[model samples]
Target: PGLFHLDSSVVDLSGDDFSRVHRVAPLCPWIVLFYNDGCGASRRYASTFSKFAGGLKVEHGKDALQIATAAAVNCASEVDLCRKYDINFVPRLFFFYPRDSSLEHVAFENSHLEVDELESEVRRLVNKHMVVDDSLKERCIDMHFKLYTSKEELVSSTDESGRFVETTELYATDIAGAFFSAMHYDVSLVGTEPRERLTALEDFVLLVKDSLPSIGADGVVSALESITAERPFTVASWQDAVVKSGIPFDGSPRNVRWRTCRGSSPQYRGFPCGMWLLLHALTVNTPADRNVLEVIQNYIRYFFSCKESRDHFIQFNFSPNEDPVLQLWRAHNNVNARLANVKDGADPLVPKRQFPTLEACTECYDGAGNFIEAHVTGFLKQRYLWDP
Candidate 1:
């Protein structure tokens, strides 16, 4: 369950481009989930995905979305593809409306930052971006974090030691310390009023902190293979062996994160850890591209609007090509599963309405909390998230 990326380029059952899912606009609005090989954050997500599963097509009382093994999931150089689009980050679920192949619209995108907002964005974007017949409106859809405890409290790590309350001799201690040492970012929650949905999400992530097993990528795949194939693998059977989570049958993101804090260990070998390596690399690389930085100037417009990273001025100093934390982040590729999510801006109170103005959604749907969850859920979790 390490940092998992969802690249849609894998071959479809008929041996077609993994992008073969029904398209909204021919050559436009394509969906993709960019994840790393393994990491805790990735695994945390895959854990919930492993339960509450969804993504099957119905043909007169029959399911039709072609489900496949994790091995069968297509693998391709998405980094190259993302580079063409100027994207960066892991679990970068994308609902892109490719315009002429080169300058498509990044209609909906997310970097596992707004877990609660993930699925809602998918719904908004599917309506805004995906091409669908009215008959199929009810059909399928797709689509992290550490924290200073609940969203209600400000986790000022100024004098503290770690990021969480469970300060064992192993894991990082307080909220602030955890972000700086493990996550390496100055973290904060959405300062907006407590919207019900987003608040519920806070409960969700905390749930993860409470339960779930830790397993390696190979071991998990083994569990999954035997799971859907009906090999006597039960969720309880995998208890403490696998993270407990809810897999959605429809494209809804879970209300809680399911995970175990995995400090430096050799046993973690799933997609969560390595996956985060690839994801964090895109944006965390030192000396971020000036042009790239300019594009999303509006990105920080909301939640952290009044807030700025203490090191915002320092990130550029880290390196134009290297993030100060890149080396440690690369290590994400080594672990099995740990979980993280975008802990802010996902106020469940955010409207279910489509982008007020279609352009608001289509113009730059950069995971402003839409479609990101849908695309990932559709491609990956839809099939593999619920079993052992």
Candidate 2:
């Protein structure tokens, strides 16, 4: 009656029914919003929280209640319950994890209460803690598992050992394809703050202009420059500028095909792998004077979509003295180590392992299976060369 109606997805808990949280906390996660109905701030925030709960219910359907519960406590009525949890403030959101013996709950950082901010936090929590069975794992794997047109071709071309056959035939089409795919899918062109988006785009364009030659880098750079001159350009306006600069946006097979970057399955590697390949390729080809590492760091910090991968890249203590090629390789291996055990979104056929296995690059490692940094650098340069 205070805020959430009977139709609201949030379950309004009375002081007597408060034990239901403990009963449910052992089975599934709970997000409870503690609020005093009379408080102005609580009333102001009620609509947003209710909208979030409704959206979650629609997203997960019946499983929404099974997976997690959205609830609220009216501290005005349940004074004793509020006192027990030390709810000194109104409209405090707390997340209770399943099987928490201490009954300790996590408080949501009350920053801007945007729907997206709350949703992302909830997703991060679920992805981190959700116990996935084989069935659930398969479903997750299948979510991104697509059948690309080149899948059969790539699969057939592989050797009897199932190892990706390395060929010297590098294609401009592949690199261009990867770039376009990343722009279209990976980078958030819209919905982001204008200034942040511009900064990310500028960093990306600069990286391309310095590193990639004869691959439409100049066109993209000029297009960005022209579009930015108008100031506060929309995604459509940028696309128009790119088109006017003679960069074709044709939806042809060659424009979208991934030859060198093709993974065993669509979801195996693809865009992320292609991006790393591009960065590694740039580091190897760019001159010594260029701070490719710093450029890459800035680009990833601003533009990279994967938050976990971004965190890993930022957290690594990269040496300024080390060659950019080796620095990236080490950073990649570190990320691989963290994701080695995470199987939900992994390619079952191509299990997570250290890159460039002994079979792929015998010279990269020594007899004891330790990486010879010099040899690894050379191998990367050779493998990631533009025309390799």
Candidate 3:
């Protein structure tokens, strides 16, 4: 093993170093190693990494993993980082991003990953999302599959060359967000379209409802990963495509959801308003009176944040119904609120009503719909967010 003279700088760390080095370079994708004297599996990982070393960078201190390492014997650059990340368990690999606490400790226990396999995985992570640039990792993009059933995954969107990781439970939404955010994808799953951008009074109401302060003073958040261990959906393309389907050359009305037969029109473009028709079919079929009020409030607040975003929802006609999540749906801009409230109301046959099955929620989200409608994003954005 000593055929050639070598003086590669090694970063040693324990498992507890996650916090200290967490901010060393938070948003950037990094690998923190836990090893002692470069003798065991840690050294093996290093050797493996050295072979296929591409853009992947390694840090070692006394676990000087936070920054670059020096080649001098036993030189130290990161000690506290190792302690905070917990180095007691030598040979640990934590794929991390410091900018968001939620993404700090992914793959904390992946000793099973071989050096080459691990290296490949890390490269894919970096390529899908440059920690220095965009946060949209390949893992984040995979999340779109979670919202649909196998029968619903008609038009495939996964990257063919990307490494595949099977989902554990179809219902684990938070974990999906965490994995995506860990790789750095700004995400959130909202349940209500705010009636207005939260004002100072919003703090009082939030306190009343035990709301999280993560929204901050300005009510502007960096990303969901910074708030909870979750991320949000960024189905920009798919949503845009659905909105323009009804036009003469754009396909027919029956091809509402995933028109596999239709040739590609525009790529990544979607009808943002298409989300409503899909949401109404899933998770919350109908809401009670209180649900109605909250959704209304949510839409109001969301629109205040951006006029374009607000008008998008109006196009969808997001309204209340006695079915699903809201007892009534109100798309005063898209359709009407009074109809679901005290007026003529929904169709006598469908007769909007609430539902509790997870299947229902997912079903609504999976089907083809037009995001061209106003409130499509406003409504679908909140379809996943429940009262915290």
Candidate 4:
């Protein structure tokens, strides 16, 4: 008998059952695991595969059978089935599409992948083939939601003096607001490794501790420390810690408001803009000798929510020895260039252009319109840093 018994979530399919379920008209998508009962690796992986199947069963309930079937075949007994699929390996996974008469199946390359990775891969493939509406396929990386019509409609409006002031003062409120919004809206609260999530939060907090006021920094640090003190922490645990930390911004509307990063419309620049501003502000305020790229990279790796944005950022070439200020400046500009081509989520009023336009900083650009490193560094410092 195979490892997956009748009680298991996976359906133990014989040759006739497999042919009838898979080859029938209006067929459901099938993810099948072919395994030899005597193989050690197959026996060890059976539990994981069963768990994955059980999760889908719980999520979709009765509809799971109609939507997709998670099944298994014992190569020892079902020799004909194994030969039909050309199963040379002890444990192999394959996905069969819904309506393909050719019996073509997509093979999963990594047999030892984790449950989350396997689930995500399955979801991606399913979404690719089944998504009928184009809008459902579109994901806004910037996390923009059109809530307000004008600046005056904003919950946290600018003060009279601050409104007209042209000074480059980075407010703690703006940075904290951006951080909260990014964590809430952008970052994936679940489906991430616990240690990676904790480390990302620690690094981001350590980098911005000095930038934020004593109360703000202490509040967030307290929440993080509390989470770390417990056994295993989840995304929900962290969220609960923030709530119990008694931070002023935890439940307040100020956590979502934007000041320096605000665009013309509600859908315009917000969290992403504020995030860039925070990075530039931190880089410029820190010592020129220190390397902050590792912290920034870790943040992007674990905390950045948008898959497309994260993928694009990982592919960007960065110099390890370059000044952090200029490094981030170039990276931001690269994003600007890329986003310029993508008009779906763009703000109509604020066109994407190279930072430090000719009018803003004439010295920052040369005759050919290329960035002058030293001038850009100075320009970034003045733009991001506030007077002590």
CA lDDT, every prediction? 0.28, 0.59, 0.31, 0.59
Report residue 301 deviation for candidate 1 (angstroms).
26
Q: How do all the candidates rank in terms of TM-score, highest first?
A: 2, 4, 1, 3
The TM-score obtained by model 2 is 0.54
3 or 4, greater by lDDT: 4
Query: Between which residue pairs do clashes occur in model 4?
Result: none
In order of listing, the candidates' clash counts read 101, 0, 111, 0
1 or 4, which is superior by TM-score? 4
Error of 4 at 338 (Å): 1.5
lDDT of 4 by residue, 261-323 (tens): 665654356667767776777787665434466677777777664444566676766677777
Question: Candidate 4: global Cα-lDDT?
Answer: 0.59
Mind giving the per-residue lDDT tens digits that candidate 3 earns over 172-214? 1231222221111111111112323323223322331222222
RMSD of each: 22.8, 16.8, 21.9, 17.5
Q: Which stretches of candidate 1 lie over 4 Å from their true place?
A: 1-30, 48-78, 98-103, 107-110, 113-116, 130-132, 135-267, 270-388
User: All candidates' TM-scores?
Assistant: 0.28, 0.54, 0.23, 0.52
lDDT (10s digit) by residue, model 2, range 176-219: 65565445433423312457666766776667666676556677
lDDT tens string, model 1, 204-314?
A: 222222221221223323433343335443323433232222221111111112122233221232122222222232233223333222211222222211222211422
Stretch of 10 with least lDDT, candidate 2: 141-150
lDDT of 1: 0.28
Give the least accurate 10-residue stretch of model 1, judged by summed lDDT.
143-152
